[PDB]
DNA sequence: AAGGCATGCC
DNA sequence: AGGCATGCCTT
DNA sequence: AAGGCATGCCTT
DNA sequence: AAGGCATGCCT
């Protein structure tokens, strides 16, 4: 099968907000509004802004999980490519071979599903700062859309649930995602063929 | 190590807790603990008085450990150790290894300890009622690198985790606190609390 | 693992050489060797022929064994291998170890040794003397990842050494050429010579 | 005791040329003239030129040598800090201990000296590419100047002594050196404090 | 690149 | 100690 | 197949 | 930082 990639905000009014960055060649991540599509860096940190109209009640968690956007691959399970899976880069806490890390919360969770064999990254929902308007994760992700035996330069989404602490859904977005060396100038790349 | 311990702060039955003194806030006072921030600032080896306080005297033989974790999970599961500079430097107390970040000072009862599971540090002496007319028992710390040492910390913040602990080990007590050691702990004290509030 | 296996050019009691076609410099020319760098430039899986010349014939039983080995000193304890995309790949030519970056097409004698002591790869071929006024032995190789692979040559130089031995694996005569694994051989070629004058 | 500092072109009109690399903030390398004293990057390279009026015979050497400038620590070897000794920057020829190295050429040798224990770096004496007038060795130089447990802020001095093959002095030059994180801003900063207001 | 600021030291 | 010495971040 | 482009990386 | 270049892929 293939996961829902359906806009869903639900009761807490759930969106997802992003850092506007620019275009610099080599800036670290930014994201494209004409292309709802985040280039960023392997490795690097990549901002994701949760955004509700009421806040969820406890205990619930927010999943990341990356499909191939393209039809004729969405069954395929998105994985690190061979050499990345195997590079020393652990953070101690997520699996090798998952292309999604959370960054910076020790409550992260990393899954291997058992029936559908796909990875996922899962945080418990945390409402904002005081004076802060949305919560932000920090993901990174492992490979480059490039890496050849992984990715192979084949776009993927990521779609972002919030969901109750049995799994039930509770809101679901997506955004479509390329790993670069170079977001800034890939960004306008993309842009610019759209044309 | 392959694993991260808690900082549940945990009373436990003796009502355990820590105390810090007031101190001042001009540029380079050598120890200042920020309430705000529950966090402590101070210079490499000066004195860090932390006051232990508990509701009832625990027995003979419960023991304060003090060991140092990197605050930040990405970094949690490494050890929290000296930079190869200060490891090498001629600053033993008589005591105290190389290697070790954090000293107690003016104990003779002190002992230092490697896990052989975890190859954590931490530094233990024997839990001692407060002095007559006394309200709690102070501990005089050191920490031996800043958190900028190059190849140690590396600007990386850390906890020191203090544990009240019975003769074999098991836990009595919980408390944590963030530490900056740095050159200007009043300056970089200020900083910090300015941050919050922006 | 290990140490680095001799490179030192030993023509021997045979009078050993080697021998390459003088080939185009088209951008993208499946294998083309340059005389000034000593160098041959290729595509992956493509042929590659190397010709074995010698003054004297070697006897009944002697064998031909490639291996390769990193160029740079920093790198040279390091096993040549294939980056793990490729060793996964399924382009095996039903003979070759899947590890393994050279191989011989059309040679049903064709070995190919996990050395155990040093971990090197090679593959060895019967030596055949040349045939009916040919002058040369000619062995068709094929370089199995590009230089640029990343987790295995990962754009670090490596020479390929021809090594001519007896049929108790006794050295003979030696010689050796580097390199390039590439997408656009003819284009590579041409920059790097371009960059050596 | 402290190696010799002093300048001399000796018969062969020995003398160093540096690039001029002009002072934006995070220039690799540059040098100042009215200061003598070249400021550079962690690790990158540092071009000087060897100028001769006439050409030293073949086994000659060209060696550099760090030492501190101020006379309370001159007698103290100029070493790489603790942390950077350690770190994984090798370039498979140089000491890890060795603040001074050159890139980019095979037939560099290193020296610990038997009696001093000061290091140096060496390379064979080569005349000017044909068409150019000078030779260029690229140095590297691996801890900045301000590293705790090495040079711990402390400014050095580097002396390249043109030598033959006995390591008899022919002809010496030298120049200060700060390594630092901003050199076209330091030696912004350094030149204006030459200046009375 | 080159603004911005962290952080040691005076 | 405000002012500087000097490193490292990201773009 | 030369020409153009995709895309990682180094330089300053 | 954008420029430049290495180096795979395509039409
Ligand atoms: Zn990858
Ligand atoms: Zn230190
Ligand atoms: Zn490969
Ligand atoms: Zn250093």
Same mark, same amino acid.
């Given at each position: 099968?293939?996961?829902?990639?359906?806009?869903?905000? =639900?009761?807490?009014?759930?969106?997802?907000?992003?850092?506007?960055?620019?275009?610099?060649? +080599? #800036?670290?991540?930014? *994201?494209? $509004?004409?292309?709802?599509?985040?280039?960023?860096?392997?490795?690097?940190?990549?901002?994701?802004?949760?955004?509700?109209?009421?806040?969820?009640?406890?205990?619930?968690?927010?999943?990341?999980?990356?499909?191939?956007?393209?039809?004729?691959?969405?069954?395929?399970?998105?994985?690190?490519?061979?050499?990345?899976?195997?590079?020393?880069?652990?953070?101690?806490?997520?699996?090798?071979?998952?292309?999604?890390?959370?960054? =910076?919360?020790?409550?992260?969770?990393?899954?291997?599903?058992?029936?559908?064999?796909?990875? +996922? #990254?899962?945080?418990? *929902?945390? $409402?904002?700062?005081?004076?802060?308007?949305?919560?932000?994760?920090?993901?990174?992700?492992?490979?480059?859309?490039?890496?050849?035996?992984?990715?192979?330069?084949?776009?993927?989404?990521?779609?972002?649930?919030?969901?109750?602490?049995?799994?039930?859904?509770?809101?679901?977005?997506?955004?479509?995602?390329?790993?670069?060396?170079?977001?800034?100038?890939?960004?306008?790349?993309?842009?610019?063929?759209?044309?």
């Amino acid at each position: 099968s293939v996961p829902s990639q359906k806009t869903y905000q =639900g009761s807490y009014g759930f969106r997802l907000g992003f850092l506007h960055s620019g275009t610099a060649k +080599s #800036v670290t991540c930014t *994201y494209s $509004p004409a292309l709802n599509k985040m280039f960023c860096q392997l490795a690097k940190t990549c901002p994701v802004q949760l955004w509700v109209d009421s806040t969820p009640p406890p205990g619930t968690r927010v999943r990341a999980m990356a499909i191939y956007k393209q039809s004729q691959h969405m069954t395929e399970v998105v994985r690190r490519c061979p050499h990345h899976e195997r590079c020393s880069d652990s953070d101690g806490l997520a699996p090798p071979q998952h292309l999604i890390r959370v960054e =910076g919360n020790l409550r992260v969770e990393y899954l291997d599903d058992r029936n559908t064999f796909r990875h +996922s #990254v899962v945080v418990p *929902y945390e $409402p904002p700062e005081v004076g802060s308007d949305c919560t932000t994760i920090h993901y990174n992700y492992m490979c480059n859309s490039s890496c050849m035996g992984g990715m192979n330069r084949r776009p993927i989404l990521t779609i972002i649930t919030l969901e109750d602490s049995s799994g039930n859904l509770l809101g679901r977005n997506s955004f479509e995602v390329r790993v670069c060396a170079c977001p800034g100038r890939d960004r306008r790349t993309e842009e610019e063929n759209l044309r």
